[model samples]
Target: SIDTPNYDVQKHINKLCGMLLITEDANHKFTGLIGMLYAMSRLGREDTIKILRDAGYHVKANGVDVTTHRQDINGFEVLTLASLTTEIQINIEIESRKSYKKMLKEMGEVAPEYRHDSPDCGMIILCIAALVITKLAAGDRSGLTAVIRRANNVLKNEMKRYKGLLPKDIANSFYEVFEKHPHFIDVFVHFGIAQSSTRGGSRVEGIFAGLFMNAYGLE
Candidate 1:
């Protein structure tokens, strides 16, 4: 899993204080360490548990010790908790957009909805990849929330830019991709895997990208 580069590690842990309901002062010095572990794990870093423990951070959750990097507290549980945070959702969307951009670059201007998969009895995959990109630098946390907020605001305030049929256009795009192409549904499953892997800079995304790249060919 790729770590958020140069992130303020302590700042992120501080935010977890509220999520875990940690008091400013607790009898145990490491009262907040467990919560921090949960937060860090969700951000794609499980190794933090061991690093903090070695540094004398005592962590326990649900009456079980967590200093040994145990799996008693599942990563999924951490993700579920973080899902309610506005920042978490924004981070997810940001990563999603980055993944879309990488896929587009690898795929070129060829419509996602229209591409040939195999040689015999062929049908062009016509699933157009819908994406939008911002100029925000990677891993820059400064006003990151506002960047997405402004984009979303523009979508509302600039409705006239779409000529008043944006809703229908969006609806039709979905209908064509999902309803018109049965193979698209299967491709979407792969797309999700690829997107997630790409976000983390993992080999799995590369494998899927190569597989899809070969499937589509150069058209």
Candidate 2:
């Protein structure tokens, strides 16, 4: 069957996340968050919401699930994490960017936990994440799809660089899962769209962008 796996996407992602968590490096930690967020969102909001709660953020309210009403977007009642109380939101923002400066030191290279330990690979993954969030804010699903396809192509070319460092099957899992579904990208985009509609939402997006700039040391 075409659905059969020569690569264990679940295992690859799980092990990758484990490595990120164990490293305790800020850049690695945030990178792992992006990967987990991308994977879980595709898996479904049930798992997505559960993972958020597990990470110490709440989504459900009074026995009712509150989601972004923009169903035509991701078609899920997306919970905007940035909509959480300012204290929580600020805390998450700060912690996420605390290591932003580290990602830019000397070719932005840091200890890579998996797939050849190349820091550029991690940066590219994060780039996908940032684009998903911003494009969602722009309300461009078609545009977002194009970007993902482009990213998939780029990852395809880059995977060859890691051939000997990681098993081909394991390395392929990341790109395969990312390209296989829009569920993951939709989650981030949903959050961005919902935030833009709410009061003071742009501020949230701005903060996120500022952090991203710092991560890449753009400013």
Candidate 3:
């Protein structure tokens, strides 16, 4: 039988979270976050909340969870958006934080035991991480997804140029995330949607955007 499973964002997020658990490569691990966040942004309205809740998180939908009932906010807050099964704690805002330097700095802050010098790297985990570092750092009027897709599109052109930004690096993995979902074009839309409803949230988003372009080779 052909694999024709429907593309449910929650299921995709769950699977990607599992990828966070199971991936041996450090950078492929990053794209797991990338795929899920983009997937969440693609959803309409507060549906992203439903995705996190099902992913076994204490999700604060629209800035509150099922219990708190805070009328003040409405963003999905996954304080500990990790796995009880695998003991993996993923801080999305770090990976999704739009500033590559902040992404890398915050990444190291969260994961202290991380090693920087294996021959096996993003090699683009530096690049893939660069991809992720670049991914989350956006809050423009043009928005986050455009930033990502435009970058991906440029990288794709470079792939055509280099033939191999090659997978000793994760240019391969990054492209996989982009190519797998063709119309996933509007991927990062919900970051704005989710952040807009929360008090001072977009302010942080703004900080990330400012910090982001300055951090990487994002000319």
Candidate 4:
């Protein structure tokens, strides 16, 4: 299960919809849409298609609106009050599968896929940090809440064993690939990452900061 335990997919989608309402810039809007889409992609092929299929369904009761983007209250109206012609329905299915597959390909990253077989704690932290910036937030935390925290602690413990604080210049995959993703690490180094700070207070936002050193072993 790559899906985290704490993340509620529908709820995340709702919030991204809210983000679009508040955000003003073109870049921000694009990101919010992508965030919503990325989270939806995490639902994998089956559930996403089901949601899309329902969104295009003819029966009002059978409809499911995953994104409350343009629709104010009566979202089902788009499908129910109107009609999904064969071409329209086919377009929905075709575009959705095509778009999501591209998104997944770009996101078929090097971290979460290997968490079960190997303890790549550092890579997990780095990628989830990217995830936080691009897809999820951690003020309230995410589904990978425990997994992320435990991995951070594991990386910290490894640091304690010998090599002090992990440097920002390590050559790990996430660092090499997603190096520009977030500066959450910049704040991390400034705030510090000793025993207590590394536990990262009540939120999991910066739990992945000082993992530059831990990344070396995993990659």
Candidate 5:
């Protein structure tokens, strides 16, 4: 997630305060930690949430359209609506496959009618890897490299699944390679791990900044 240089985080904080009609008291808190974390990472957490929540409430009240930059309301709306359908399917799947189940199994089988133009697959993948890492740190035998390898294989098979729809051989080859090694520390590092390691921090902070702009309808 690239950081936005032109958009001032401090300004957003001030604007959020104004939008929410809240005083500059730092006591106000956001409902969700993830949103607050994003706000906190950039603008002050409590302030950013108030601003966004206010903006959203205002838009709904006035019939004003709030569009996420890359992913508009429709994209998320679909996710929300599909969630109900998915829940039904998930319940069935869970009952059928008790403990061991693959996420891709469901996602690959069901999809919304439309595709996301600004797809952030890395975020989802990183979160999944995060879970795996927690398990590893807890003395699990499954190594990080194995996770990558398995992810790569799934991605490769996905390519073959959609090879006909794709245009170029290079693209297919890249897809194949990716499927073969989905959990390369290199790929994740390229996302932020590598740079953060070099600088003694993580690129996750920067990514969250980018995610905020794109998801919040801020260019």
Candidate 6:
């Protein structure tokens, strides 16, 4: 389930390093736009948690519903505040553009509240990919099968979430991706592929990613 066949953790780490570079090159614009403080965590440092706490960032270590957690990787720290909500919304709008509404509606078909929170599917998928990359980089394979099984459940259910009106290709891709990578359940679940009160869509995915990047990556 690692991102690259070579499984070079540094390469994957470098990929994230690139993201950090981009964020840095943007002169903190990305961070400011998204209202996120981004940094890389080496595997399992844990002390950064206390650092975040000292900084007044509400951080948690385990699963926290992707909405309220502020923690990041064990070696990294990404700090964000409730106030960043506006920048996130603006950033999502800028990235998604006009299709944002159509995308939001498509997402709303599964989870109505997602539009306000996430706004697009692309961000969600990318976030999921990023998480898988990080976790594999950190060599965490706990609960692997259960994760894949859950993602498959979501992809199958997305067929219904969108009212079965989406293109056959997209539906098939869901199953295909699930079959290929079972660890992506978090993404699928975020997108409303499985059974839950929340029906997933891209916007929900974005919110899930933007709101809770660290917790999602680790858990």
Number of the top-ranking candidate, with TM-score as the measure: 3
* Model 5 residue 207 CA deviation in Å: 7.8
**Best of the two (1, 2) by lDDT:** 2
Against the hidden reference, what TM-scores do the models get?
0.19, 0.26, 0.28, 0.18, 0.19, 0.23
RMSD of each: 20.6, 17.2, 15.2, 17.8, 19.9, 16.3
Q: Candidate 3, residues 130-178: lDDT per residue as tens digits?
A: 3443544342222334445544553443333222233333434444444
lDDT of 4 by residue, 1-219 (tens): 111111234343333322222222212212322232333333443554444444452222223233322423322111211212333323333433344344347558423322111222222223333433321233332334443444445445433321211222111212322233232232222222322234433222233443322344335
> What does candidate 1's lDDT look like per residue over 1-219, in tens digits?
112111233233333322211111112222222222323433332333344445454534121111222233222112222213344423333433444455457667534221111111000011112111111123232433443343334333222211111322322333333343333333343333434444444332333344334333333
lDDT of 5 by residue, 1-219 (tens): 111111133332222222111111111121111111212333333333344454442211111121222322223111111112334322322332321123235455323211111122222223323323323432434344544444344344332322111112222222333344333222332333322333223333344333322333322
Identify the leading candidate in terms of lDDT: 2
Across 1-219, the per-residue lDDT of candidate 6 in tens digits comes to 021111122222223222322121122223211211111122111433444445454544331111233423232221223323434433333333334445546545525422222223233233323333333432445434433443344334332332211222222333334445343333333333211334465443534344334454346
Q: Rate the local accuracy (lDDT) of all candidates.
A: 0.29, 0.36, 0.34, 0.31, 0.27, 0.31
Candidate 2: tens digits of C-alpha lDDT, residues 1-219: 011111223343333333332232223323424353434433444545544455555444221122333223222222233312334323333442333333435346444432223323333344445544433444434444544554455354443333211212222333333345344344444444433344443322344344234343332
Instruction: Output the lDDT of residue 209, model 3.
Output: 40
Residue 135 Cα positional deviation in candidate 1, in Å, after optimal superposition = 30
Those runs of model 4 whose alpha carbons end farther than 4 Å from true positions after fitting are: 1-200, 212-219
TM-score of 5: 0.19
